[PDB]
Design a protein around this ligand. Structure first.
Ligand SMILES: CO[C@H](CC(=O)O)[C@@H](C)C(=O)[C@H](C)/C=C(\C)[C@H]1OC(=O)[C@H](O)[C@H](O)/C=C/[C@H](C)CCC[C@@H]1C
Ligand SMILES: CO[C@H](CC(=O)O)[C@@H](C)C(=O)[C@H](C)/C=C(\C)[C@H]1OC(=O)[C@H](O)[C@H](O)/C=C/[C@H](C)CCC[C@@H]1C
Lengths: 280, 280
């Protein structure tokens, strides 16, 4: 078999172009460009690479560089200022933060209307309750892929491998919203293979190179590989053995060039959504 | 033959434990927990209030005319949010047609949302960091705990994906280490899922929806249905006699999950008081 590619790099480019078109239309109408604020505390690519994508679509981005000595109170005051700044549509806080600072308290201080990452508990809870606002970036990008390839999700037996807050858990609530039967597996799952073998739609998010063998994949399955595993040679591979899974799957995301670009594109979509729906 | 999960008895023990904790607060000179219930118009309230009096809580009922505007209602929630003697706020639905349900319910501070359905609280549970939790799913977890049922590694299947039960139930189960499948109206071949379920939670509101002979031998069956029949009886979503020939444990109806829903509301109100409002 020869599974079709889910070309996330191309889809992400189409999404960014659509956003750029809407931004250019706002400017022509006399409206401001969407604005993104990134908060960096102390010091420790992805942020750089993201700003390039924001430049492409016509966003304005601003980056705060705070010293390591910054207190939790100062940081919370900054989020208050950005929350109140009408030119800011999205706030991103890069982790890790200095020790002694409560990560949760800082991230939850972001107003959910500017949480373009989609991981404020209010936004997660809204998605769970079938009334989404700003959505978790990576699971929403995956649903966008299925839509752009015209994959009917209703009644698909979907299996999510990994139950992380960043992917697995919100992924199951997106998939339920899309009408899939959803199974979430994790380290306590016994007979992982049995679940995988019955999956019409497999979302793999364990962060282990080549963890899922092609042998396990249902014939005709749709395979979404969220893994981005840095090998020592500097290159990146997914959680799925591409060459073996492509013998059985109907569609498969490569790595690189699959979910990664869609995570960035969804962050960009969320920022335009925050701008157009919540602040203008 | 299946053993009974006697939720009526468990609920009474949970209530007795709350009541004795309140006794100890009084002996130490601390205030009793307080619950406010807001009703707008006319249309289970008496039974929940009943249960609050049994455990020595303060209770407060606001009975407002159908002429109440949205602005007045929001002002009341603000007042209750700021009242240090109130640990829980319940707003009864439905509200008059002219009033925005969502804005009113989301105005409740999450640490007084003892029903557990503010999106912030649902989102916190989704993120493995629960605060006040939805009452029916949390009551079901308590049932499994009190019967010493080890949940880690169990293949759990939820029948129904309602906001009030099925969806939050999957996040409670994931937190309890279950491999969790959520099925719903678009699920293909329910029998295949039910036959593999070590733990089956049925919450569709349809008497007899799951035939008893689908139940896996030795499964734990949790019946959340409360269906009033033509002959005056109250029945669950599972035919008890048929399921009881195969299950190791089964909740009856009535007397199973229903009492635990009320007891968990009580437990949540004590929790809000002890942990979030008047800690020691
Ligand atoms: C374009 O995708 C590249 C691959 C590929 O091409 O397939 C890809 C390599 C890339 O450079 C981009 C910019 C980056 C991302 C997708 C990273 O996610 C984040 O940055 C998220 O916004 C978030 O900030 C971070 C989450 C994790 C805790 C750690 C980072 C996860 C992930 C790699
Ligand atoms: C003691 O349980 C009785 C059964 C039995 O004994 O087995 C049981 C009959 C009983 O009287 C109690 C007071 C009531 C509940 C459990 C009701 O749920 C709610 O009120 C929850 O607070 C919440 O408000 C739910 C609302 C639903 C949309 C409709 C109500 C569903 C449900 C019956």
């Amino acid at each position: 078999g020869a599974a079709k590619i889910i070309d996330g790099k191309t889809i992400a480019q189409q999404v960014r172009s659509e956003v750029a078109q809407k931004v250019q239309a706002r400017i022509a109408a006399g409206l401001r460009a969407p604005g993104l604020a990134v908060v960096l505390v102390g010091s420790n690519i992805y942020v750089a690479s993201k700003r390039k994508a924001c430049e492409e679509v016509g966003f304005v981005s601003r980056s705060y560089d705070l010293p390591e000595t910054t207190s939790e109170a100062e940081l919370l005051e900054l989020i208050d200022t950005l929350n109140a700044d009408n030119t800011i549509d999205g706030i991103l806080v890069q982790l890790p933060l200095p020790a002694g600072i409560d990560n949760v308290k800082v991230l939850e201080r972001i107003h959910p209307d500017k949480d373009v990452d989609g991981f404020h508990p209010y936004n997660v809870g809204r998605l769970c309750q079938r009334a989404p606002r700003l959505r978790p970036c990576t699971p929403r990008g995956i649903v966008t892929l299925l839509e752009r390839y015209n994959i009917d999700t209703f009644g698909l037996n979907a299996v999510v491998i990994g139950a992380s807050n960043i992917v697995g858990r919100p992924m199951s609530m997106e998939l339920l919203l899309a009408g899939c039967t959803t199974t979430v597996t994790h380290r306590f799952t016994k007979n992982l293979r049995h679940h995988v073998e019955n999956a019409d739609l497999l979302i793999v998010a364990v962060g282990k190179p080549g963890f899922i063998p092609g042998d396990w994949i249902k014939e005709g399955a749709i395979v979404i590989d969220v893994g981005i595993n840095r090998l020592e040679n500097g290159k990146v591979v997914g959680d799925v053995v591409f060459e073996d899974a492509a013998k059985r799957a109907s569609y498969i995301t490569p790595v690189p060039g699959g979910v990664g670009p869609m995570t960035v594109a969804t962050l960009i979509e969320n920022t335009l959504q925050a701008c157009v729906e919540y602040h203008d």
